[PDB]
């Protein structure tokens, strides 16, 4: 049994020469003796918990169905031959040089790189959204990059089927996405069941690519809205009229007027077309926010835009013990024979 930091990392004879990558459960790289490339392997041990089972099953199901150049695939899944003996699952994925979190911490991005990264994010997102799926946790660290800057979206653990008719909820209740990338409506009146949630996150990522700093670095859940409104300025009457919930609307009406910070002041070196797109992605009113297909068609991305090479999904998506069986069944295809 292969060990890494005194923990079982039991990936069998196919995968040898392991290195600790990080405890995201545990991630290691390994040499794939069939394909003769190094690969990334994630040990998952979810079987005690409803929620870990749920996220693991949901994610395996999604990644196995999706097939897209800008979405991480599952290459293999390793587990014991029986439910009884299955205590962990190993997911094998392409080893990627880096991720956009890592890259932003150290590397200035040229406008060509920002454009290309944005294109690839949106291309992948077009596919996701076309499958009626919301990623719901887009952020730099979930955007993987190889040495030639090919980008792949990962981590669908928090994804959901879109459900715009049931999106409404009360004020300060919802926690969807990672804070800095969370759309204002999540705090106000949204369960994050609409595609606009992901576009907001992409907007935030784009801003972060322009400056290497998060645009809305909320210190905590509540501060996040302070940041958003500090840049977007006070919502318009029309946008407030769109919020029927009184607690949310009256909270916003209670705030002192704040003016918009012009994007070309926040990002003086940015391409003007990039800022135009950014503006459209970081629109306060999620109904007015650009959608993924419009974003791909924006002038900023004209060098790459090619709808015929921006595929959509063929097959949109519509207790723990049973989830273990479903995880066991979902991973069956990877067993010998």
From Swiss-Prot:
Activity regulation summary: Phosphorylated by MAP2K1/MEK1 and MAP2K2/MEK2 on Thr-173 and Tyr-175 in response to external stimuli like insulin or NGF. Both phosphorylations are required for activity. This phosphorylation causes dramatic conformational changes, which enable full activation and interaction of MAPK1/ERK2 with its substrates. Phosphorylation on Ser-19 by SGK1 results in its activation by enhancing its interaction with MAP2K1/MEK1 and MAP2K2/MEK2. Dephosphorylated and inactivated by DUSP1, DUSP3, DUSP6 and DUSP9. Inactivated by pyrimidylpyrrole inhibitors.
PTM text: Phosphorylated upon KIT and FLT3 signaling. Dually phosphorylated on Thr-173 and Tyr-175, which activates the enzyme. Undergoes regulatory phosphorylation on additional residues such as Ser-234 and Ser-236 in the kinase insert domain (KID) These phosphorylations, which are probably mediated by more than one kinase, are important for binding of MAPK1/ERK2 to importin-7 (IPO7) and its nuclear translocation. In addition, autophosphorylation of Thr-178 was shown to affect the subcellular localization of MAPK1/ERK2 as well. Ligand-activated ALK induces tyrosine phosphorylation. ISGylated.
List of catalytic residues: 137
SUPFAM superfamilies per the UniProt record, alphabetical: Protein kinase-like (PK-like)
Extent of motif Cytoplasmic retention motif: 306-310
Cofactor(s) required, per the database record: Mg(2+)
Cellular location(s): Cytoplasm, Cytoskeleton, Spindle; Nucleus; Cytoplasm, Cytoskeleton, Microtubule organizing center, Centrosome; Cytoplasm
UniProt keyword terms in alphabetical order: Acetylation, Apoptosis, ATP-binding, Cell cycle, Cell junction, Cytoplasm, Cytoskeleton, Disease variant, DNA-binding, Host-virus interaction, Kinase, Membrane, Nucleotide-binding, Nucleus, Phosphoprotein, Repressor, Serine/threonine-protein kinase, Transcription, Transcription regulation, Transferase, Ubl conjugation
Reaction catalyzed: L-seryl-[protein] + ATP = O-phospho-L-seryl-[protein] + ADP + H(+); L-threonyl-[protein] + ATP = O-phospho-L-threonyl-[protein] + ADP + H(+)
DNA-binding region: 247-265
GO annotation (BP), single: lung morphogenesis
Residues recorded as bearing Phosphothreonine in the entry: 173, 178
Effect of residue 175 to A: Inhibits interaction with TPR
Phosphotyrosine: residues carrying this PTM: 175
MF GO annotations: ATP binding; DNA binding; identical protein binding; MAP kinase activity; phosphatase binding; phosphotyrosine residue binding; protein serine kinase activity; protein serine/threonine kinase activity
Pfam families according to UniProt: Pkinase (PF00069)
Record PTM Phosphoserine, positions in chain: 19, 234, 236, 272
Enzyme class, first EC level, given as a word: transferase
Family to which the UniProt record says this protein belongs: Belongs to the protein kinase superfamily. CMGC Ser/Thr protein kinase family. MAP kinase subfamily.
Disorder named in the UniProt entry: Noonan syndrome 13: A form of Noonan syndrome, a disease characterized by short stature, facial dysmorphic features such as hypertelorism, a downward eyeslant and low-set posteriorly rotated ears, and a high incidence of congenital heart defects and hypertrophic cardiomyopathy. Other features can include a short neck with webbing or redundancy of skin, deafness, motor delay, variable intellectual deficits, multiple skeletal defects, cryptorchidism, and bleeding diathesis.
This protein's domain notes: The TXY motif contains the threonine and tyrosine residues whose phosphorylation activates the MAP kinases.
Function (record text): Serine/threonine kinase which acts as an essential component of the MAP kinase signal transduction pathway. MAPK1/ERK2 and MAPK3/ERK1 are the 2 MAPKs which play an important role in the MAPK/ERK cascade. They participate also in a signaling cascade initiated by activated KIT and KITLG/SCF. Depending on the cellular context, the MAPK/ERK cascade mediates diverse biological functions such as cell growth, adhesion, survival and differentiation through the regulation of transcription, translation, cytoskeletal rearrangements. Acts as a transcriptional repressor. Binds to a [GC]AAA[GC] consensus sequence. Repress the expression of interferon gamma-induced genes. Seems to bind to the promoter of CCL5, DMP1, IFIH1, IFITM1, IRF7, IRF9, LAMP3, OAS1, OAS2, OAS3 and STAT1. Transcriptional activity is independent of kinase activity.
Protein name, per record: Mitogen-activated protein kinase 1
Species this chain originates from: Homo sapiens
Gene: MAPK1
